[PDB]
Design a binder for this molecule. Sequence first.
Ligand SMILES: Nc1ncnc2c1ncn2[C@@H]1O[C@H](COP(=O)(O)OP(=O)(O)NP(=O)(O)O)[C@@H](O)[C@H]1O
Ligand SMILES: Nc1ncnc2c1ncn2[C@@H]1O[C@H](COP(=O)(O)OP(=O)(O)NP(=O)(O)O)[C@@H](O)[C@H]1O
Ligand SMILES: [Mg+2]
Ligand SMILES: [Mg+2]
Lengths: 621, 624
Amino acid sequence: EVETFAFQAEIAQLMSLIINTFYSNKEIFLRELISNASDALDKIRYESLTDPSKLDSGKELKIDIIPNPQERTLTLVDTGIGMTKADLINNLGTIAKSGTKAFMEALQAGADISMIGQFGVGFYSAYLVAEKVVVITKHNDDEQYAWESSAGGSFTVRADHGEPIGRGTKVILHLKEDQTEYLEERRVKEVVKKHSQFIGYPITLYLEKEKYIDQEELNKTKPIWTRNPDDITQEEYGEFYKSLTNDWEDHLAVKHFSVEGQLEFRALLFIPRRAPFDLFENNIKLYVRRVFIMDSCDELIPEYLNFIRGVVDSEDLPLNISREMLQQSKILKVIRKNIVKKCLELFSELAEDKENYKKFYEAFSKNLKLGIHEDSTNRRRLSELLRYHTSQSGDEMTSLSEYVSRMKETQKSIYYITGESKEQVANSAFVERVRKRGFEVVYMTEPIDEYCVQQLKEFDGKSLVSVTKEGLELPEDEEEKKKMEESKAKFENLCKLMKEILDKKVEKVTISNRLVSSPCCIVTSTYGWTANMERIMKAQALRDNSTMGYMMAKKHLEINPDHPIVETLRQKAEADKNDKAVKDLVVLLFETALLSSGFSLEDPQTHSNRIYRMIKLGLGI
Amino acid sequence: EVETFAFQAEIAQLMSLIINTFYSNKEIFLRELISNASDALDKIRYESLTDPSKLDSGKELKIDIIPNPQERTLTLVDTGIGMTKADLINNLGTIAKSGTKAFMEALQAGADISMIGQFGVGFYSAYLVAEKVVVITKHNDDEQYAWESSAGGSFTVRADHGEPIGRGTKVILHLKEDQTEYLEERRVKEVVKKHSQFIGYPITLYLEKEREKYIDQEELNKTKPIWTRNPDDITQEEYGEFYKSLTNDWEDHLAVKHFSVEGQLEFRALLFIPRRAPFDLFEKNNIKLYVRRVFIMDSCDELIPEYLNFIRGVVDSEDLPLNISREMLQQSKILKVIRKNIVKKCLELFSELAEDKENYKKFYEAFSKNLKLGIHEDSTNRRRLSELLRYHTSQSGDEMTSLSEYVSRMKETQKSIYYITGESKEQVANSAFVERVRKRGFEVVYMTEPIDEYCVQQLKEFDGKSLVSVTKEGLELPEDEEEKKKMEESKAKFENLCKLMKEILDKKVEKVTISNRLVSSPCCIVTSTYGWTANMERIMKAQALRDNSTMGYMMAKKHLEINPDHPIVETLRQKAEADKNDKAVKDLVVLLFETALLSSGFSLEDPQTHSNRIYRMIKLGLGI
Ligand SMILES: Nc1ncnc2c1ncn2[C@@H]1O[C@H](COP(=O)(O)OP(=O)(O)NP(=O)(O)O)[C@@H](O)[C@H]1O
Ligand SMILES: Nc1ncnc2c1ncn2[C@@H]1O[C@H](COP(=O)(O)OP(=O)(O)NP(=O)(O)O)[C@@H](O)[C@H]1O
Ligand SMILES: [Mg+2]
Ligand SMILES: [Mg+2]
């Protein structure tokens, strides 16, 4: 009844699939060949550990690239283990059969090798470019053989009897007409640097330049992340960073770590000394067994840490058939979690070095505050890295932890004020009273600060209070409260008169507890956008205008009872309930308060015209 | 001497390779199986054309998806052509052997068939989820067979004697415990909608529910792909229905561009302009690529420019170099050609829509930001995008006019397009800079949005006429001989006052002089020729991510321009001649400069100083 069968494969169609569909970019053939060559070396090197006599054929392990435009041939020579005739038929001649994996599983216990080859289809990627491939191999055991093929479903193995190759393999690709750009020095150098830059063995490119053969070592920067982090000095770290980033300045700080368990990977991160000019408009590169896999973009690192330049190297990771992406995206999330944790730890330990942390903060404070805006899980740890200019700080910047340390015994919040400049904020009207009482105020004078404090609601159990927002309530004395209530009862009449005069401009006009020298100030409502925040949002190039009015706040006017102007205005308003002079005066006062508070003016020409008219009245016109 | 050989393939490792390495996301197995079913149907339908009697076994072409969580089996049934025992052994058994490809190539002439299958490795993707796959087939010629395997390098073919199927193939996936999420109704619906939405034949999801344990049938591909139809025959109601089904918006499509491109790269595209603007427009699946009515990839800016991402629609192709996983292409030049054609047809669509005045008003009000972003970025398509611009001008009124109309009404002697940028229409219209120009009857373009600065950074001229910012220095209107004589006389007279004001406001204004752009305001602050305009500086001084040092590289060199015909300026000149220095004249000059700085759009370096000066002036005025 039941008739069992066995799976088969269409060799011609399978070869066509490998040639045409597996690999998107045709330049990766080098990446494969060198990889195979690397493995060819690794094997023999391993066999040299317990038997040095196996290296008598050749004492040197190297890789050579020889472009010959005369015959349009790209040659890749390696002094590796080489392949026997049986190895030629079984390994090269069989698709999906890798000799490297078979060698790897035949190792005793846990050895020190880790070879790239896993799938068995890497070699045929050479036919992405070549129209014919000739592999001249010479193993230590049997004689030198030649393997010729053109991906036509058949290949020929022949005794070579050519010039001896010592030990190893020489792969000659007869490039097709279209893909002749790989004979150029520039293309070969670029490809090798992009893909197989960190191969352990020296890769030498031969060329012809009177007329002599010139040799150039394509890879010279040894991958230092493999070495133990404790052994590496700072000079080696700087050299590696400079070679990696083409930067004359060395690194500012370096975090070299390793994660072991079900997911083993070691990473090396660098903080640049300065910030890139272009910046926001390649940061982290993922390596598997020391060969390039993919370039990180929002996967390994968040957007706000895109200034970190580094490498991630893993011995075992699921890989695409094309060896340029991973199979499981969850692994990328795990890598990101570990990298972010180690980066925050690096920043925290860097905060001890005062001058270095000053440089780092001056460079990447915008990134830190962007992370506070975005990374909700790391807000509590990122906030401790914030440095701000305060009233008690002076020229230097102090952290919020220092603020809490110096915070008065009865103070219950951290008072902050935002503006477009440090001078405007320092001389601003809102902080006039608080500084009189001795409470430290935090100046935040960058556009990213508004985004930072949209999310950073509190810190160290102390809430942030905006001085320029309504409902500010400093601790009060009983006498101060009595005076405030009496002044409110006295000035309610002028307040309602001003409210009547300033219709649809100010929702509420009240006396203020935050003014000591300025006559009046315009203060944003509780939930709406602050003046500075409204200025920032109004200037965004790509943002909906029709929605702005939903988030725009309602202005509140606050008058100072002790300022002479307000008292005189109150007396005039009581004496004359309606008058042209008082109306003009209150309109001008509101205009000045609007200008000083931070708000833009709906028609500044009107205010300027009023000033010009009063100037004319001053000098006579 | 020379010993030829033949290539081989290690079958077990090859199968493991297909299962583990080809496909990243495991949900695509349906995408493959459904596709096979589609092909299975196509063939039989073709064989009905020359032989209707061959459909006597079953007259219905359909696809059924039956999840059975009791046995953890996902069944996919199709009434397709079916496979013989020989086809079971060869087509299903042999990897990389596509019987569909053989059927396609054996077709004579060029037939309407365009079957999805091309590689021969699609079926084994079913082992991404299943631990054992059973395929019950019934070809129209031989008896019903059963093909069972577990990807262990061997499969068994058995003469089936269960419930007859009549015709077609029924594949049963015994899902592994980990991948049990595909027995859920929601997951199956989501996968089918994402991948196999536009398969020509109906797809039905049989299920068991209670309303007492009834069987519910639900079709998951009700929407049909209309882009295959000729664009002339389609009506606006059908286009609206397609847009609603594709985008899940109650609003209709604002406009539609449906076009086919033939040749060495043949593809049909269907683009829709949303009536409104998405809330997260600038905060990634607008254009979806299809090959033979199967979803391939989302246009992550490959098919469309970034500024044109507001446009929705589909791109469908028949012949296209496809990846092994069918989730991308092999050549990016194909994507570049696709993008070029899409952009050309989008610009043509916008030009056509510009005729419809009300519809173009809606479209512009929705996507003028995108148009100006394109002008900033897309350099090749600047003439058309510029011609698609509508602006508020001084002579326009409330309604908006194009720059071409501005040039049409442009005076005979005028030789430029005078524009002024600001943060509001009222502020710009009442601004001092345009006081003289409008007095002489020259139309001025109000540019009252932040993106306008980026738009005019690149758009240097239009129709051979150069754009000139009134707020920038060197503004030279066409001037007569007597006007130039008056300007020279004023330059002669106010030289001493200009020198005094330059001395007083040291390191704050580079140059103080007379001007021809003021008729009523005393003074104005004017940006230099090279640096950022005042509005530009205001805009990029408020960007969240900006380089402070770079801010200082392109700062404007402020120029003060006074009005010789303003009474304040003449009185100030008289006083400055009376006293080479005085406190009153210095205070007046500083206050005038501050007012000009405020009106010009420049933010004060310290508003507290100006406010305190005004407060002191008020105190003196009312008496303190
Ligand atoms: N230069 C070489 N020297 C020695 N052995 C080689 C060489 N090139 C290839 N081989 C062997 O031939 C096999 C076939 O090559 P290849 O297709 O690259 O397999 P693979 O590299 O192990 N699989 P992959 O992960 O894609 O690199 C290899 O696995 C090696 O065993
Ligand atoms: N439901 C079915 N009815 C009939 N034939 C089927 C069915 N499912 C699979 N086949 C056959 O299976 C063969 C190979 O399966 P498949 O893995 O889909 O290769 P394919 O058809 O080329 N699809 P693809 O690999 O994506 O190009 C096809 O040529 C069909 O003849
Ligand atoms: Mg290899
Ligand atoms: Mg298929």
